[PDB]
Amino acid sequence: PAQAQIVHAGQACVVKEDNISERVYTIREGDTLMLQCLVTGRPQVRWTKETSVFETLRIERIARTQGGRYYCKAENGVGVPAIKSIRVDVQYLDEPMLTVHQTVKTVFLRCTVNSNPPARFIWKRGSDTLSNGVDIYEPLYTQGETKVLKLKNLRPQDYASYTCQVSVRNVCGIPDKAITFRLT
Amino acid sequence: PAQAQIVHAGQACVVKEDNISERVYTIREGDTLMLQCLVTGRPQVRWTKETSVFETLRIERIARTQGGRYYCKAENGVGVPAIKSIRVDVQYLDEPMLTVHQTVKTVFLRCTVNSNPPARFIWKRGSDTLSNGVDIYEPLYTQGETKVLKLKNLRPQDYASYTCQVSVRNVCGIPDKAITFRLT
Amino acid sequence: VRGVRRELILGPVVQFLGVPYATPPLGARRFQPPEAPASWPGVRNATTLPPACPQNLHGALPAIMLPVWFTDNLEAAATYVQNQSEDCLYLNLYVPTEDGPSGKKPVMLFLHGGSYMEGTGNMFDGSVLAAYGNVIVATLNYRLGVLGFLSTGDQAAKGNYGLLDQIQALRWLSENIAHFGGDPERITIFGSGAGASCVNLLILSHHSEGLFQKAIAQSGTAISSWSVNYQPLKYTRLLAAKVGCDREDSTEAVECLRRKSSRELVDQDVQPARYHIAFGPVVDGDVVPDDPEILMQQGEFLNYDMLIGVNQGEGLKFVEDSAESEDGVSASAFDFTVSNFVDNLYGYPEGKDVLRETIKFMYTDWADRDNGEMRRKTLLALFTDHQWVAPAVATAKLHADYQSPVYFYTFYHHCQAEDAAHGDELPYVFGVPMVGATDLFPCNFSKNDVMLSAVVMTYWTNFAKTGDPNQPVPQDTKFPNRFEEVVWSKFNSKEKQYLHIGLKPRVRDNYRANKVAFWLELVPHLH
Amino acid sequence: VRGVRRELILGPVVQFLGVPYATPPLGARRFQPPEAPASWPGVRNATTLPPACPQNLHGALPAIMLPVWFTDNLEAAATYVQNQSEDCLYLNLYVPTEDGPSGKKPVMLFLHGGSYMEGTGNMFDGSVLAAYGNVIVATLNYRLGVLGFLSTGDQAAKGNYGLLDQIQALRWLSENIAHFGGDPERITIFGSGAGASCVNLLILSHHSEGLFQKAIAQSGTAISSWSVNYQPLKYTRLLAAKVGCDREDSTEAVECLRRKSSRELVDQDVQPARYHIAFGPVVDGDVVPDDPEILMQQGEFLNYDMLIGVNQGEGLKFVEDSAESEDGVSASAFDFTVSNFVDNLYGYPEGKDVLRETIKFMYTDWADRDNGEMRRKTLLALFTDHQWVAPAVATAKLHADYQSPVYFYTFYHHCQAEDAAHGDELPYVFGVPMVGATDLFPCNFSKNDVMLSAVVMTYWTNFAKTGDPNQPVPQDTKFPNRFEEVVWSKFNSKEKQYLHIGLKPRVRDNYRANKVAFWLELVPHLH
């Protein structure tokens, strides 16, 4: 046999895997990656998704667009080249963005954000809000995905200021960001 | 003024109405109807839905097809003819009907019945059934309306016999009928 | 009595302007059924236009639901309703000398306006029609706005006064019209917008017994959101509140309103809900025995020869919301306006979320996901479908399930100054292409535009005469004739055979049935 | 090595029947990856058909999901698979002398069958194609049924053996094919039904690195209900149970199965779930790194030139349920079969009730509510849409969202013995109209039917040569030519440009998008 088996390095966060080797390699955007691919035979290691002939893969300041599935095709031609492969789930949470709209008296607050993983949206008014005559929802055209807070009929004292607390469950050391808008 | 104002007779059941006079005149199928229409002036009474010049309307052995809205157009031409009108909600509950169907192992039991008012469907197996791996529903094409009991996968001991207890909530003295089917 | 004479191609005609049908609702005859006409002591000056009923144009204005000509040419629509008074229960007539290019001629009474709060029969000069059709055209005024339909839901203020005014005016014709060369057994009511709604409501009543045989609901009906007000108190409260009349008792609060001057009462401003109305007909239990829809379902009426139809893109106004934008209509604004669609209509709203996104789905053209126009288009349709098209079918369906003979149409023609919109069918029905551009119809009336006016009138008139539009006068327009080869089949519940009005006329089956069904069959059954 | 020669208009061809690509899985090489070929000592008798892999025809038979010719002509399909053995890892080749009516010719490898449990490459005589196309056509046998994909989900029995057999056979070509006038850098896999599924699965793998460039998924793909088994243990348990091998341990229960004779093992009968499969490929974490759909979404593959398509009314069989009835297909049976549709697919089923009635709705043609045929029709479509059409689009959408060039089609042609059904595209692809009716293709092959065979082959072959079907050999059929003035535009995520195959060929945009969307966009988002 001519073998291979991957182990992590660089900057992982809250590790989990399965029966063969590391299914997941979570990393934050801006950090450094290092994936070391072992051998038995010697063989010649091969990282790919031009076939890079580094034993250890490495990327400084890893971006969202660099994430994906990479394999390790180590070979001296002693039987079938062993191929162990791994997920690079690059993570982030942007500045969230907040538009609005008005009529008789209904007011919408639309809240987008690009994230990875998919973010969790929370709506406030000093303390957090969920279903009286006030609605929240997700839509079909989830270009974010997005979240919308609708005020059905402006009652005297739901005229205060609101916040769209987005969160990624603090995963991989990533802070919660939010956004405020006022009303009169 | 030339007036009119209706009072029931014949065979009513558990009476309910509104601010003007009897909105509803409930009656069972097979009974007799009598609706007496009073006058002030004198005027000439008029029942209609070729204008019958009876004071009191009457139908022996009232059928489902005789139900509807009838008015009383009493007139001597002293101002506007007064017109008080009334609902004849003829009531019944037929023999209910029960088909089936089979495959891998799902069994459907379709249960129709023509009723008035709309009947309430109950399903049994010695004692009454509602949600484990067993479904009931109404459809779009409510030619009854109908009710359907689906068995998802025939487990050893849901092979017993079933009953489709239909009911009209015992209203206007009408008995509950039901229907049985066996299984192997 | 006697009046005045006119002429413009066609056979000349006599008008009867300012004839009353009842004693006017002035003192404590306000918010009271109309009693019949005060007895006429001299040869009545039936010569000039009777004034309008209490309405305000300058603010409180249900845009979306009004005809286009109304809200495109307000300056022109203002001119008719300027002479206002509470004494407004006067009808007009238009009767001809000779048949236009001696048996008792039929009667076409016009209900009108657009909202329950706006219009007069005066705006509609139904003179051409009378001449060309050779029938008697009647245009009236009923009580509007507050005066028409304020209600408590008590014996104190039953409401449906405006209808009773129409009913009486109709009863005037029944008893009298005979003495204008008229016919009491071929009377024909016809409407538009609200009038349509009214037409359909009279039908369901008992109080319109021996008064008419034939009915024409041009774009609208009684089961729509804004045909019938099922919350009379709540809005009367708000009215009573703005004039200090809202007492805890019913009867005393009514007798309050009497004393406030009519001028002061109507021009007050109460907005209703979205896609609803505050002042309109109500389920009283006399002239509207039960919820119209329920009445229509159970067959609690009698067999009036119906003629309902509908226009391509009725509620154009609905998308006049962000019309001037033309990157299209915004992607996510589509979501929004639908969300408010579902909420003020179906918004019960335990399982609304589905209802929104699934109704979004049916109208988003998946060919081009990204084009704003081919949402705008569709949004028009969406609204169109729900607030006229579908209802109209289902009414027909019922009225022919109980075997009133009935014919159906779709109208497909503008004539541009500045998509066939709600109202645009009117000038063609009232023959205005044949006289030239009036103040509230500015259009380049094409050689074609005329052909269309003839054909609609020929159909509509015939219909009054027999209860069959395509029979009596057959289709001609050679004074080729594109409607020659075509017979308006009867509508029924099965093959929903209807007439495509337009430059390309024909019979088709099941108008828009796909969407029809979505609204009639699936959606209410979600909850 | 050397073999045998044949001929029928066209340039003659050499066959290579019974060439092995790996040492056969016999002892404890069963349920083990194929190791490469045992070394050939002498000129191998590459002359007659290699026998079939372990399958049972006489009962356990996934009707709905198999090609039509298969289940219409079983007696004829039986004849090929009668010589069975466990030693079945042999491919065939078809290479021509001269160009049909020595620079390295491309390679078209055929994956096959219809279910994962039924077929051999022998059934498909890819000889005509080779001659007319002037490329090397390869038809193989992979391990079937139990032998192909039994799994525990452990290191004990990883599964995906059948694929690894295909992968190795492909690796044989890569290393060797050069020595038949073949080309190792223009190898092209192509499939049907399950083969299709397999094609799509190899693509997503790592183990098919330098082995092929071009891929053709004729009607089917990897994300469908029955392409991939996500419950391997449950069904292996039932198999182990019927042969007394179901031990509590994994590894011991596997080593049990080894010793039971192959004959005895496959012909055992386990039914799976409705619209699922019990023995098939699995997410192992080697040849199927993750859930196919998830892999396809995140872009965890490389850019293979794809060519997917789909036939008008694929799952005709689905409505072979009450086909012979013709009062139509029953009103309330429509409800029923849909209820089981939603349950065995989406039936989670907290909010199912909606899902049923709303999916009923989209497919009931509201033009004629009452006609059974125009439900039957639609039910075919319903099933068709969900189990091929839509998936196929969404795969394309992704593979072109990541910029693999890819072309799309729809196939629209039967040729009648007894609606274009699943499978009916094959004989046209394999040129069988040009030889005359074979035993499993009985049809009156029309003058036209030929034109169609030529055009598909010309397209398909060209595609192997360049990765552009409409380029290399341009469209001709004068040996008019109805495909002359038509160019097969590339597919993309936006204007879903595809080729309508048939007598009337052309480019259209957004195949069936309305329904596509319902299934891709709305429905899974209900729950």
mmCIF file of N, CA, C and O in Angstrom, chain C residues 291-321:
data_model
loop_
_atom_site.group_PDB
_atom_site.id
_atom_site.type_symbol
_atom_site.label_atom_id
_atom_site.label_comp_id
_atom_site.label_asym_id
_atom_site.label_seq_id
_atom_site.Cartn_x
_atom_site.Cartn_y
_atom_site.Cartn_z
ATOM 1 N N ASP C 291 -75.492 38.023 4.507
ATOM 2 C CA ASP C 291 -74.213 38.144 3.800
ATOM 3 C C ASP C 291 -74.404 37.808 2.302
ATOM 4 O O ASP C 291 -74.846 36.714 1.964
ATOM 5 N N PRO C 292 -74.110 38.765 1.402
ATOM 6 C CA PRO C 292 -74.292 38.525 -0.020
ATOM 7 C C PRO C 292 -73.769 37.171 -0.509
ATOM 8 O O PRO C 292 -74.509 36.435 -1.161
ATOM 9 N N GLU C 293 -72.524 36.834 -0.185
ATOM 10 C CA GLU C 293 -71.930 35.569 -0.645
ATOM 11 C C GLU C 293 -72.813 34.401 -0.229
ATOM 12 O O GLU C 293 -73.208 33.600 -1.072
ATOM 13 N N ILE C 294 -73.155 34.338 1.053
ATOM 14 C CA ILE C 294 -74.027 33.274 1.556
ATOM 15 C C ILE C 294 -75.378 33.273 0.832
ATOM 16 O O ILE C 294 -75.871 32.206 0.492
ATOM 17 N N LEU C 295 -75.956 34.448 0.575
ATOM 18 C CA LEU C 295 -77.214 34.520 -0.179
ATOM 19 C C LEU C 295 -77.029 33.933 -1.552
ATOM 20 O O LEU C 295 -77.810 33.092 -1.972
ATOM 21 N N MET C 296 -75.993 34.385 -2.247
ATOM 22 C CA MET C 296 -75.716 33.877 -3.580
ATOM 23 C C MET C 296 -75.514 32.356 -3.593
ATOM 24 O O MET C 296 -75.983 31.683 -4.505
ATOM 25 N N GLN C 297 -74.842 31.812 -2.581
ATOM 26 C CA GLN C 297 -74.591 30.362 -2.537
ATOM 27 C C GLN C 297 -75.856 29.552 -2.416
ATOM 28 O O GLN C 297 -76.072 28.638 -3.194
ATOM 29 N N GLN C 298 -76.688 29.905 -1.447
ATOM 30 C CA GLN C 298 -77.881 29.115 -1.126
ATOM 31 C C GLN C 298 -79.046 29.336 -2.116
ATOM 32 O O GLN C 298 -80.053 28.634 -2.022
ATOM 33 N N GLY C 299 -78.928 30.298 -3.035
ATOM 34 C CA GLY C 299 -79.975 30.556 -4.021
ATOM 35 C C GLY C 299 -81.149 31.343 -3.465
ATOM 36 O O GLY C 299 -82.314 30.993 -3.719
ATOM 37 N N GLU C 300 -80.848 32.416 -2.724
ATOM 38 C CA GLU C 300 -81.863 33.199 -1.986
ATOM 39 C C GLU C 300 -82.159 34.532 -2.702
ATOM 40 O O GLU C 300 -82.011 35.632 -2.155
ATOM 41 N N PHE C 301 -82.606 34.371 -3.946
ATOM 42 C CA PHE C 301 -82.898 35.462 -4.867
ATOM 43 C C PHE C 301 -83.774 34.896 -5.993
ATOM 44 O O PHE C 301 -84.169 33.714 -5.928
ATOM 45 N N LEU C 302 -84.090 35.722 -7.003
ATOM 46 C CA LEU C 302 -84.749 35.227 -8.219
ATOM 47 C C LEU C 302 -84.046 35.605 -9.522
ATOM 48 O O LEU C 302 -83.156 36.458 -9.547
ATOM 49 N N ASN C 303 -84.486 34.958 -10.596
ATOM 50 C CA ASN C 303 -83.672 34.747 -11.789
ATOM 51 C C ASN C 303 -83.614 35.978 -12.681
ATOM 52 O O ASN C 303 -84.458 36.152 -13.566
ATOM 53 N N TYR C 304 -82.627 36.836 -12.453
ATOM 54 C CA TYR C 304 -82.497 38.030 -13.269
ATOM 55 C C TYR C 304 -81.502 37.769 -14.372
ATOM 56 O O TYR C 304 -80.478 37.135 -14.137
ATOM 57 N N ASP C 305 -81.832 38.234 -15.582
ATOM 58 C CA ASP C 305 -80.979 38.052 -16.748
ATOM 59 C C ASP C 305 -79.763 38.895 -16.500
ATOM 60 O O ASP C 305 -79.874 40.114 -16.445
ATOM 61 N N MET C 306 -78.621 38.243 -16.302
ATOM 62 C CA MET C 306 -77.402 38.938 -15.899
ATOM 63 C C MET C 306 -76.469 39.124 -17.074
ATOM 64 O O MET C 306 -76.522 38.398 -18.053
ATOM 65 N N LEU C 307 -75.615 40.127 -16.957
ATOM 66 C CA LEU C 307 -74.576 40.364 -17.929
ATOM 67 C C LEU C 307 -73.409 40.971 -17.181
ATOM 68 O O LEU C 307 -73.375 42.173 -16.969
ATOM 69 N N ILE C 308 -72.476 40.126 -16.747
ATOM 70 C CA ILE C 308 -71.315 40.590 -16.001
ATOM 71 C C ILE C 308 -70.133 40.570 -16.921
ATOM 72 O O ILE C 308 -70.033 39.719 -17.804
ATOM 73 N N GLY C 309 -69.228 41.510 -16.703
ATOM 74 C CA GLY C 309 -67.915 41.398 -17.291
ATOM 75 C C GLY C 309 -66.854 42.173 -16.554
ATOM 76 O O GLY C 309 -67.088 42.664 -15.450
ATOM 77 N N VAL C 310 -65.697 42.266 -17.199
ATOM 78 C CA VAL C 310 -64.459 42.568 -16.530
ATOM 79 C C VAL C 310 -63.417 42.979 -17.566
ATOM 80 O O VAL C 310 -63.478 42.547 -18.699
ATOM 81 N N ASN C 311 -62.471 43.819 -17.164
ATOM 82 C CA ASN C 311 -61.503 44.394 -18.083
ATOM 83 C C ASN C 311 -60.141 43.817 -17.815
ATOM 84 O O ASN C 311 -59.857 43.395 -16.715
ATOM 85 N N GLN C 312 -59.299 43.817 -18.834
ATOM 86 C CA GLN C 312 -58.001 43.138 -18.801
ATOM 87 C C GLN C 312 -57.231 43.341 -17.513
ATOM 88 O O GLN C 312 -56.874 42.372 -16.832
ATOM 89 N N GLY C 313 -56.969 44.611 -17.224
ATOM 90 C CA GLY C 313 -56.069 45.038 -16.142
ATOM 91 C C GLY C 313 -56.707 46.131 -15.315
ATOM 92 O O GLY C 313 -56.254 47.276 -15.309
ATOM 93 N N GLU C 314 -57.749 45.739 -14.595
ATOM 94 C CA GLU C 314 -58.643 46.654 -13.888
ATOM 95 C C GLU C 314 -57.915 47.632 -12.990
ATOM 96 O O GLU C 314 -57.874 48.826 -13.279
ATOM 97 N N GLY C 315 -57.300 47.128 -11.925
ATOM 98 C CA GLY C 315 -56.783 47.992 -10.874
ATOM 99 C C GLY C 315 -55.413 48.503 -11.216
ATOM 100 O O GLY C 315 -54.518 48.482 -10.377
ATOM 101 N N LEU C 316 -55.246 48.994 -12.437
ATOM 102 C CA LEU C 316 -53.992 49.578 -12.857
ATOM 103 C C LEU C 316 -53.412 50.446 -11.757
ATOM 104 O O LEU C 316 -52.229 50.390 -11.436
ATOM 105 N N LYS C 317 -54.291 51.251 -11.170
ATOM 106 C CA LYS C 317 -53.934 52.106 -10.031
ATOM 107 C C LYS C 317 -53.119 51.393 -8.951
ATOM 108 O O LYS C 317 -52.124 51.932 -8.468
ATOM 109 N N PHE C 318 -53.504 50.173 -8.607
ATOM 110 C CA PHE C 318 -52.762 49.375 -7.639
ATOM 111 C C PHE C 318 -51.254 49.432 -7.851
ATOM 112 O O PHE C 318 -50.510 49.547 -6.886
ATOM 113 N N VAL C 319 -50.826 49.367 -9.109
ATOM 114 C CA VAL C 319 -49.402 49.480 -9.451
ATOM 115 C C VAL C 319 -48.935 50.882 -9.852
ATOM 116 O O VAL C 319 -47.749 51.073 -10.137
ATOM 117 N N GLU C 320 -49.857 51.844 -9.910
ATOM 118 C CA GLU C 320 -49.502 53.277 -9.866
ATOM 119 C C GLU C 320 -48.800 53.658 -8.520
ATOM 120 O O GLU C 320 -48.431 54.825 -8.349
ATOM 121 N N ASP C 321 -48.634 52.690 -7.593
ATOM 122 C CA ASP C 321 -47.806 52.832 -6.350
ATOM 123 C C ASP C 321 -46.304 53.224 -6.550
ATOM 124 O O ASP C 321 -45.824 54.205 -5.954
#
